Amino acid sequence: ATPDFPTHFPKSSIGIENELAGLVVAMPANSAQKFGYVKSAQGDALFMLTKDMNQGSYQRPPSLQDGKNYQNWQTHTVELVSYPCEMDDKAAVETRKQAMLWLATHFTTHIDQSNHQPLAPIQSEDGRFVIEITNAKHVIAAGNGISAESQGQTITMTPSGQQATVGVAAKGFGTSATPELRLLESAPWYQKSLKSQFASLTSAENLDDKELAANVFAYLTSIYLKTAELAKKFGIYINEWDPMSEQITPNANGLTDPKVKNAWEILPRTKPSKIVEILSKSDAKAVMKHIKPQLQSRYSESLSKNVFQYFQDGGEVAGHGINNATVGDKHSPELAILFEFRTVPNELQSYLPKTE
Ligand SMILES: Nc1ncnc2c1ncn2[C@@H]1O[C@H](COP(=O)(O)OP(=O)(O)O)[C@@H](O)[C@H]1O
Ligand SMILES: [Mg+2]
Ligand SMILES: [Mg+2]
């Protein structure tokens, strides 16, 4: 079994995703995403081997007929998914990039001498890296996995196949305290002006933590307003809101549609309703009560009520979120909130492996 991601980090964390070019993985239909993982010889889990984009049904080449059953098998692109590490842990970041580049060279040899065969659990030649196979019911095949033989491909990685995910303490979003926080706050959907706006609305209120409440308000309102903007732009069905009732033609498959995710640029990966937990019951009530009018002064009553209710009931920004991540003291953990960079910006390029 592939180990689950560690959930706790002392400070800000980073994970990477890297879709490979030059090969596919074929597995039985409805297989689990993870088929293996690469770890250091010391035992530290570095990245997972996963199936990513479905490339169609697998057809075992006739010249490679082996008496085996490949019925209903699907081909997918391979994505290398790192185990998160601390953002300032240079050695952990470097070992992940190096282990990914090593596995690409091992894949290049595998499609040359063992095309349409499963990867074997081996140790690298220098002894640095170890492959562990968790699902042996797979095959690795060059190109799109149609031909028995490769076109002598070198297995590569490129920025268009790359993403980075950053995890920060929820209480830090809006403080601009670290370079990571400042990069996250530069997200086009985040409206820092909502912090000072909240303070103006709540002068008569005796709030337990005014600065924290203003930060949470700005973060949540920015997400709710962006969701409403996107639902209108792309014609997305949110809860009971119907875009056709506002003469908007549906132009996306939902919140999880890749073009909707891309429109966020910096995609929230944590369930918005979790942040309410970093506040007192009283402060959370004050924050939540003030969000509704921010939507209603910009969007129709139906869109506003539906977006507000969707997130209130634990609605996700774009599918299953990373909601169990924590930061700070191991004994008293604080909520970490995660963000996916759809395109890796210049500031995070050094975290990604490069073939060239
Ligand atoms: N605590 C964390 N801090 C930072 N990045 C994390 C953390 N936990 C997971 N990630 C990263 O989240 C990314 C996507 O994770 P995952 O949920 O497995 O992908 P998917 O939803 O596409 O199946 C990976 O780059 C991974 O390293
Ligand atoms: Mg992934
Ligand atoms: Mg991604």
Swiss-Prot record:
Disulfide bridge map: none
Phenotype on disruption: Deletion leads to a loss of TseL secretion and in turn loss of its ability to mediate prey cell killing.
Binding positions (ATP): 13-17, 82, 269
Binding site for Mg(2+) 1: 17, 163, 340
Binding residues annotated for Mg(2+) 2, in chain numbering: 17, 79
Boundaries of every ACD domain copy: 2-356
Subcellular location: Secreted; Host cytoplasm, Host cytosol
Transmembrane residue ranges: none
Subunit and partners: Interacts with protein VC1417.
Family: Belongs to the VgrG protein family.
Described purpose of this protein according to its UniProt entry: Part of the type VI secretion system (T6SS) specialized secretion system, which delivers several virulence factors in both prokaryotic and eukaryotic cells during infection. Forms the spike at the tip of the elongating tube probably formed by hemolysin co-regulated protein/Hcp. Allows the delivery of the TseL antibacterial toxin to target cells where it exerts its toxicity. Also acts directly as an actin-directed toxin that catalyzes the covalent cross-linking of host cytoplasmic monomeric actin.
Official protein name in the record: Actin cross-linking toxin VgrG1
Species of the source: Vibrio cholerae serotype O1 (strain ATCC 39315 / El Tor Inaba N16961)
